[PDB]
């Protein structure tokens, strides 16, 4: 609390390329001063939601570790990123625990990701045999097997690739736009306090 030792949490909110939802990114914060006032007062953050800690008293309690999770999803299932619900992405790509604490952030990317040619690099998973435990990645791309028949890696019919591509273009409207999502989580009561905000008077 000087402030000079600001951890680089600006680029986790503003970078070149966000990771896809199936291969989302995690960043670890240590020995820093946590000033969220520059982000709360900033304009274009469309969604600011959390459950465990207060939305405005987040500088008055002091933590030990901070994990910043970043990915990009379609605009509708920003409703679905909250813990409890199911379906696509919540079960097959990213699941939050029922006792989750931390704040989720969502904003639009109208003029930063849409391309007239069509962008297909952002993938999502549609076919998983098991269910995702909370905070778990899945990078394996072996083809789904459906009950029986010898397509167990032959990649033919009655067997579908799990990683499909989004539909991302100026002709699209609200609901199909790319929303950047970053989730700030934290853990407590195992170490001396390292990261938390400055002192005012």
């Amino acid at each position: 609390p000087n402030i000079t030792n600001l951890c680089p949490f600006d680029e986790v909110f503003n970078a070149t390329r966000f990771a896809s939802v199936y291969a989302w990114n995690r960043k670890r914060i240590s020995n820093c001063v946590a000033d969220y006032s520059v982000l709360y007062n900033l304009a274009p953050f469309f969604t600011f939601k959390c459950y465990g800690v207060s939305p405005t008293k987040l500088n008055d309690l002091c933590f030990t570790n901070v994990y910043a999770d970043s990915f990009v999803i379609r605009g509708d299932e920003v409703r679905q990123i909250a813990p409890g619900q199911t379906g696509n992405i919540a079960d097959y790509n990213y699941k939050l625990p029922d006792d989750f604490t931390g704040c989720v952030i969502a904003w639009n990317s109208n003029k930063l990701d849409s391309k007239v040619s069509g962008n297909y690099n952002y993938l999502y998973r549609l076919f998983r045999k098991s269910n995702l435990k909370p905070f778990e990645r899945d990078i394996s791309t072996e083809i789904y097997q459906a009950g029986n028949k010898p397509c167990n890696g032959v990649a033919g019919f009655n067997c579908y690739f799990p990683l499909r591509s989004y539909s991302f273009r100026p002709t699209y409207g609200v609901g199909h736009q790319p929303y950047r999502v970053v989730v700030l989580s934290f853990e407590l009561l195992h170490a001396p306090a390292t990261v938390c905000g400055p002192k005012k008077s």
Partner: antibody
Amino acid sequence: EVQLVESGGGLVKPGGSLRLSCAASGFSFSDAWMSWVRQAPGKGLEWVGRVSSEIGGGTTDYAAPVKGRFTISRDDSKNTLFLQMSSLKTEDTAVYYCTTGVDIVVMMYADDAFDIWGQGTMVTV
Amino acid sequence: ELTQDPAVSVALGQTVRITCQGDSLRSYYASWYQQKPGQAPVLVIYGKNNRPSGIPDRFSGSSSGNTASLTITGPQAEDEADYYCTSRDSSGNHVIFGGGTKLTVLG
């Protein structure tokens, strides 16, 4: 199914250079925190280095006893992970593995739990 | 630097307890790998208390402060192997590894 294949290694005079290649299949290589690890015959496993992912900044680290003299690299087009060894010492006779940190794990931390390993190659200096 | 005993002698059908000593195990929870004779190491336990799928429900993990431990309930004749614990250091974020331990069959 998902596979890592190691290639390279042999007998070489000390002070030379040698390049070890790891080829991966079955998973998205561009978002994997791969690593190199070594083991002397009859001894425990010894870390060599990390390479990390470009989505999050290339932060390729190294182990303390072999810092600097080894070069690590990634190429996503040819699906290759490269380890270059120069200025060799007499203690480098070991088996080498390329190991993916994350395939099916729960993290809570930095994404490293060493899920799937490789068949590993000889090197004798 | 982690610490392990060279070998543990437990008879068949009895719970086997494997230890790992380290100063920085309060954070950076250890992971346990098993090495067969002349084979690549395989994952056994990682994370808080869970294991990868396909591993039989015989290995469990526990941690208390500066101590880490693995528990085997009802060992068979195929568990004669080496066990390695893994943690991280606070500063450099390296995987450091440990000395390992050996487990044999006393039938």
